[PDB]
Design a protein around this ligand. Sequence first.
Ligand SMILES: Nc1ncnc2c1ncn2[C@@H]1O[C@H](COP(=O)(O)OP(=O)(O)NP(=O)(O)O)[C@@H](O)[C@H]1O
Ligand SMILES: Nc1ncnc2c1ncn2[C@@H]1O[C@H](COP(=O)(O)OP(=O)(O)NP(=O)(O)O)[C@@H](O)[C@H]1O
Ligand SMILES: Nc1ncnc2c1ncn2[C@@H]1O[C@H](COP(=O)(O)OP(=O)(O)NP(=O)(O)O)[C@@H](O)[C@H]1O
Ligand SMILES: O=c1ccn([C@@H]2O[C@H](COP(=O)(O)OP(=O)(O)OP(=O)(O)O)[C@@H](O)[C@H]2O)c(=O)[nH]1
Ligand SMILES: O=c1ccn([C@@H]2O[C@H](COP(=O)(O)OP(=O)(O)OP(=O)(O)O)[C@@H](O)[C@H]2O)c(=O)[nH]1
Ligand SMILES: O=c1ccn([C@@H]2O[C@H](COP(=O)(O)OP(=O)(O)OP(=O)(O)O)[C@@H](O)[C@H]2O)c(=O)[nH]1
Ligand SMILES: NC(=O)CC[C@H](N)C(=O)O
Ligand SMILES: NC(=O)CC[C@H](N)C(=O)O
Ligand SMILES: NC(=O)CC[C@H](N)C(=O)O
Ligand SMILES: [Mg+2]
Ligand SMILES: [Mg+2]
Ligand SMILES: [Mg+2]
Lengths: 542, 542, 542
Amino acid sequence: MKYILVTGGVISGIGKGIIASSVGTILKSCGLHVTSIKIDPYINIDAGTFSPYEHGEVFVLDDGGEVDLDLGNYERFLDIRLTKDNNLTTGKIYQYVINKERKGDYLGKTVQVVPHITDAIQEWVMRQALIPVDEDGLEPQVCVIELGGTVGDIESMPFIEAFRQFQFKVKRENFCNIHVSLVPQPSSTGEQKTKPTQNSVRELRGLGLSPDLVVCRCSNPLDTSVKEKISMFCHVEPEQVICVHDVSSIYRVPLLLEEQGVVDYFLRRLDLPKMLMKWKEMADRYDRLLETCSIALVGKYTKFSDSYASVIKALEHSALAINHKLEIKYIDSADLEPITSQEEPVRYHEAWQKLCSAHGVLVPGGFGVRGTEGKIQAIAWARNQKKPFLGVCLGMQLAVVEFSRNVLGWQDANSTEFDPTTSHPVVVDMPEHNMRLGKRRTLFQTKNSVMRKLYGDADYLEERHRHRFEVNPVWKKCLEEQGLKFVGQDVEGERMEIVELEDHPFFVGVQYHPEFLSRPIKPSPPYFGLLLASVGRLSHYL
Amino acid sequence: MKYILVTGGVISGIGKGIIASSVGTILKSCGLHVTSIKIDPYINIDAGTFSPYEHGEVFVLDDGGEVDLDLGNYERFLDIRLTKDNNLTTGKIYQYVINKERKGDYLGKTVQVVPHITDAIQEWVMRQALIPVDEDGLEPQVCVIELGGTVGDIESMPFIEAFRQFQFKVKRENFCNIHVSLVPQPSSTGEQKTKPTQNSVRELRGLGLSPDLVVCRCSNPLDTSVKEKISMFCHVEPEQVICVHDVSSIYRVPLLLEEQGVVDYFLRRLDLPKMLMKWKEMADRYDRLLETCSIALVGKYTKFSDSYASVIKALEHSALAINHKLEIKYIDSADLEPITSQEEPVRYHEAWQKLCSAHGVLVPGGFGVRGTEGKIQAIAWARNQKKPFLGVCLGMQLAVVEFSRNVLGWQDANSTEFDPTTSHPVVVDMPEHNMRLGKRRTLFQTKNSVMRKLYGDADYLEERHRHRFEVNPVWKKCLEEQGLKFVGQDVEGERMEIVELEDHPFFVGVQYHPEFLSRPIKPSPPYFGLLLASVGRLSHYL
Amino acid sequence: MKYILVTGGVISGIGKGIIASSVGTILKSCGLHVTSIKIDPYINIDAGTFSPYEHGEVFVLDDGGEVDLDLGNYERFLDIRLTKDNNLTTGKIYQYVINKERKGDYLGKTVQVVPHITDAIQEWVMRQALIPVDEDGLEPQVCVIELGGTVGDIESMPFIEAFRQFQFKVKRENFCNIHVSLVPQPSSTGEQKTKPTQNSVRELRGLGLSPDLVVCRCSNPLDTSVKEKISMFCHVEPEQVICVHDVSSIYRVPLLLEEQGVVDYFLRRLDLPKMLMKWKEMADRYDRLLETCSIALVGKYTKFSDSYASVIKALEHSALAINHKLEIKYIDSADLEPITSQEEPVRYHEAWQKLCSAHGVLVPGGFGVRGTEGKIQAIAWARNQKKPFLGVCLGMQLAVVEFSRNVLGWQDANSTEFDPTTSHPVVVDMPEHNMRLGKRRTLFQTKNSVMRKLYGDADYLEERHRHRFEVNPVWKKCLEEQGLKFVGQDVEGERMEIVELEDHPFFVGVQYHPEFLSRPIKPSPPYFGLLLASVGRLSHYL
Ligand SMILES: Nc1ncnc2c1ncn2[C@@H]1O[C@H](COP(=O)(O)OP(=O)(O)NP(=O)(O)O)[C@@H](O)[C@H]1O
Ligand SMILES: Nc1ncnc2c1ncn2[C@@H]1O[C@H](COP(=O)(O)OP(=O)(O)NP(=O)(O)O)[C@@H](O)[C@H]1O
Ligand SMILES: Nc1ncnc2c1ncn2[C@@H]1O[C@H](COP(=O)(O)OP(=O)(O)NP(=O)(O)O)[C@@H](O)[C@H]1O
Ligand SMILES: O=c1ccn([C@@H]2O[C@H](COP(=O)(O)OP(=O)(O)OP(=O)(O)O)[C@@H](O)[C@H]2O)c(=O)[nH]1
Ligand SMILES: O=c1ccn([C@@H]2O[C@H](COP(=O)(O)OP(=O)(O)OP(=O)(O)O)[C@@H](O)[C@H]2O)c(=O)[nH]1
Ligand SMILES: O=c1ccn([C@@H]2O[C@H](COP(=O)(O)OP(=O)(O)OP(=O)(O)O)[C@@H](O)[C@H]2O)c(=O)[nH]1
Ligand SMILES: NC(=O)CC[C@H](N)C(=O)O
Ligand SMILES: NC(=O)CC[C@H](N)C(=O)O
Ligand SMILES: NC(=O)CC[C@H](N)C(=O)O
Ligand SMILES: [Mg+2]
Ligand SMILES: [Mg+2]
Ligand SMILES: [Mg+2]
């Protein structure tokens, strides 16, 4: 096995997960099988409890692991299928060591941070680094470990101490460490200041790791004097300091690391034996593209961009496949609510100006009441104005509620997530009996859905879910005698998984999250359908 | 005595010297007498060896101390007269303790970093904090100590350990600590990231100082969530975290600290008993000003703004006194050289486009050959085109060389600093016999100089010098029978200190550095003369 | 060059200077030329100011360097001749870097702890490691650097940081690090506790040095479980942990390191190509010896054993050469004073019981009044009772005072060090005109001195001095017409360097310090003379 540890220097949210992914695409381009581990020093067992404002959206794996969005950056770049335990946490590690102590497996000896926690971290890294994550059952050859947080955080020190031991448990050709650090450049002075990178390398060295690369993150490229100053004080050779400046899209980061020479580094550093050309082409297309498309994103969590991270990537993959610039008009759905118009009318009219000037609309997934009435407002707009619509998870449920309120005329209709008093309870709590969570098979129930044609006319699809709630089979017929067709359903037909509306340019609900299976050269079919429909090309594609 | 220690967090060049000066103006505005110490953790005894690219320009004190430019920020804001030993260094401290050990004053005991170096730091701070630096012989009441560098630099630790002891040598009402730290905000995310400030406060706490204020330096104001996060992790009350965002001029920093409430803090923190209005007025005038003046700065050291720091402040004081915006056209003097035109013609024509479009020209001081021929080129332009001219130190010497080459016609004429082969050696090496260094008295030798009128028609002036070279008294008469009048000279008349040219709008050489005595409401008369002349108002002022 | 850095772990005064010397004898036994450097992190330039209670006695080198007593441990074991600069201090380093900055040799750049102090430490170590210190002008092959103090002392960190850089400035075969640490064993528990060694290795690793040997200092040998626990937590192989338990004499430490296997370590660790047998023989003789001799040591500084360290070694070398156990009766000379008898009579009678039961007496060197009258009391005893006497430096001066007071009858006679009012000023302040300090040549002025016979009947000897005071040539004749013969004098005959008394078994004064040239198989002739005389064998030897 080869192991690459990517450590964070001065801040988190620095791009360290794009460096870890870019290194994984460079090694993938050398023909190697690549896997990844995200270490999150937090004490949570999984991401499944998080409010989307903490660390961005919750990504879902094939096995139903609710994980950090960095597991989505690895899957997008490497086109792998990670498992629950490729996210490693101090919660998962202390729970594992604690259960192993209660079972008596430490043979009546005292269990400690060193050795016993740091041994469990090294066991876990080796155990996961051997699991096949490519499309073939081939063992990985290199494992990129990204350590979340920054060095010298108290939560991080068990992992830095575990990798301090690991770099001698394995021969030097098998372990390498990249340190990703900030080089700030304040407006008052215009010097790029290297001191925080010097202190960060000195902390990493003081915890017993020598960085094999220093990756300086800065807004614009290093001056040679600043790159030589880093070399003097960080005790690293001039070709061994990399700058990753702000690029036009993340597809230029593998190519920026290739210009800075890391491929010619890892081949001599790790005793190793064309595909960067597709990242080159994609990046050069993205820079060349010149006419816009615009999607309204009718978000609940609209405070931060990272709260819709895989959705924004699925819209960008689809826009690059249809050769358009993408303008995501971010709308806080609470501003579409008619209660906002009574007291915050400048927010109400800004949201509606954005929603009306959009070429198509996306109602993404979510949980709990806040913003729901604005999502229903935007679906009603999309029906009546005939604007192309994608409803994801919550957006399918709220399309069934909207069609109940304003097509069947059931003005009291709601999901029983949001109002459990409701008569006409058209969406219902419906758990698993083994939450419809992780990968499941959907079967098509028709030949002639536009979604069946976008999915390439196989009789099934396999897709990933979060939800707890479903379309009620007592009210299914009352929706089907009118304009909604539940084109996709589960293997037993108890659950509605895809809905399509009659006599609308494109209006689809999906119960799963298509964005998790979007890949840079292969957009998820629903997001491609919305992009095609909003530029008018969905009729030509069929 | 009261003591305020200002510490730097994440980078140096953060504005920590403007915070230390602003705190000094707030305490000055509470009617207190204020003094300052700059601690430089470097091993240099003084700034007198530095190339101006290291830590900016060399400031000169009344006593001839060559010191850091922060001693100039204190003098500009507090209008004090600091001494050589208000700059404290590890060089000065280890030399002091080493001489004290060789003299036997440590009584045959072993001398150590603790106690003996840390005791000498506390002795020195107390000794200097009692020296009168105001215009009256009044003892200071508060001493602002600024610690240069950042916390957790190996050079800084003797001083952090000395102040850890000091905060218990004096009662709590007498000692207070401000920590100035960076809060970066990367373009990729737009979160203000507080982690480096948390780590910096945790380092300062770990070295045994609790910050009484945390001053967050950021490009734009803190969100309340980010200010509350700093409070949680830095263990500091919400009103005790200050943001100092990027302001339009440094005159808004005392007022920004007043809005953020530090005056209402120090009055309760330090057991203490109108003038911010003049900083308010100056800042509001500077924002209102609307028509430009432009000075060409014919610099040697033009790579960095901080290399002409007191000169830029003297031009800004003069421009605010004549009510104009100032556009300093920074010219690297080497680009005016006719050798540049042979191989770098785009640099040559850019420099000459800047020099010709300037309303007046400043040739500032310096040392050694490089760029000298471009300074002579610009003085020749200023004579022939009749553009207003100020020559400072080197610029007076090169005005006497220029007038020799192109008015007397002595084409071989040079300073013997630059060419010791020279016939007609019009500028000569001439040391002191006690370098004409520090404050000295100049006497006027005439009634009717425009410089005597700008200096308010006293028969003498007292000004500060760096130089080693002077105008040769063997060639003085040959210049005086033509257009140069040496209007100002030393008490014995051996040295030429001011020169004025006949039949030119304003063309003056000064041998001293006027910029060191510029104060925000009182510009130095030569820089005011250049500003008045270049906008045409010097004729009206007389 | 090869370099061995010996670092101290938990306490100083651990035996780290005997490990550094023992490693030097092992490499000497492999036929290598060996040199040593003592680094003292203290700020003193030299040991010449120290009260003998700080760090023990002041050792004098051939060149007149007043240095630490570890430079004497190296000279005794390696039989080398070290120079002033083989003692390196933060005083000497900061003075060297400070003078180099004032001379401008750092080219107008800022001087720092890193690089400039840490570079000067590496320059100095390389510069001194090449100086010949053996009897031939042969370049050293290995340099043992001992770092005084303990790791993680604030004074030590410049040197740990300099050796962190040095271990990569030179190839791995050329640099090796030994860490000497305490393993305490408290009476309440009887576990040998390894935690302070784990923390000390973790501090040394955290400062960036990996210990190539861990030398555990404990009262009795490590249990194998305790040696294996050190290996687990200190990350060091079981054969790479050494115990140096308390031995019967220091001659067993090279042999204890040989049993523990360090010779078979350095030969593979440092790429290297019988004499331990003489240390084996000496140690086995010392254990076998069975009948005593006893010397009264009439000390001023008698509070601590280390205050007479080279004197105790010179007495032990002489006792091992005459095949006796040595019982040094340590007497505080102030207790022999007749003023003590008036108020502390149990101290007075204990001191006199010790002095009378001694077989011979040594009055060692010193400075200043306190204890002088007790040294005169013991010399008067030694004359009148005919007990063998050695007076060293101060003891020669006080023999000339004693013979004045009680043989010439000049009851007011004193040294002018102690009473400058004195009539008959028989000892006088007499500086050098180039202090008679370092090595000087003494010439014999006679054929038939017992000291000339003990020195092997060469017409000169070369010996090392501290003193400022001498026997007065105005009173020389008045002493020579009676029983004192000044048998040894300087090259010009102005100074008395050796004195012998007529009709006494052995009564000699020496003005130099013979103890500094004592070597384990070659005692200094005066100390051998005292040992021979006190067991009666000096008559047989002649
Ligand atoms: N070179 C770059 N230029 C511009 N944007 C970038 C660059 N690299 C990464 N980004 C974006 O910057 C943001 C931060 O990247 P990310 O990789 O998520 O940070 P991280 O440090 O890895 N966070 P954490 O998971 O909290 O430890 C992401 O939205 C990236 O897509
Ligand atoms: N709030 C502010 N907004 C914009 N510019 C500022 C602000 N405060 C200070 N500056 C300017 O920022 C630069 C850095 O200030 P300075 O006070 O010299 O940094 P410093 O940390 O004090 N440097 P050092 O002396 O090297 O320890 C100076 O040119 C200031 O004039
Ligand atoms: N193995 C041992 N057993 C018994 N005594 C010893 C042993 N090793 C050394 N000693 C003695 O212990 C004392 C301490 O040794 P020394 O080598 O002077 O300590 P150090 O740590 O080297 N001191 P410093 O010079 O202050 O950094 C000396 O008197 C040695 O002679
Ligand atoms: O990718 C990850 C994963 C997990 N974590 C975990 O979250 C903890 C907090 O790491 P943060 O990056 O959030 O630092 P902060 O909140 O203290 O300051 P900000 O810059 O964010 O304002 C980390 O110490 C780590 O345990 C991350 O930080 N990043
Ligand atoms: O105001 C001062 C005075 C002195 N110094 C002294 O200069 C040393 C270097 O402090 P720097 O601020 O120059 O840090 P750096 O050069 O290592 O990295 P950059 O951000 O500058 O690229 C400090 O450790 C301190 O000893 C300052 O830094 N600032
Ligand atoms: O051999 C030497 C030489 C010099 N020094 C210098 O003396 C300083 C003090 O080192 P000490 O060993 O004396 O420690 P301490 O006095 O603080 O506590 P004790 O165990 O001695 O009671 C050290 O930090 C170092 O600078 C030594 O300690 N040992
Ligand atoms: N992730 C989602 O959007 C789930 C949709 C709905 N709240 C549910 O929880 O069942
Ligand atoms: N500071 C200066 O400009 C000095 C001018 C000239 N070089 C001199 O040194 O004398
Ligand atoms: N070291 C000594 O004993 C010196 C002896 C005498 N005090 C002198 O100083 O001259
Ligand atoms: Mg990340
Ligand atoms: Mg400053
Ligand atoms: Mg020692």
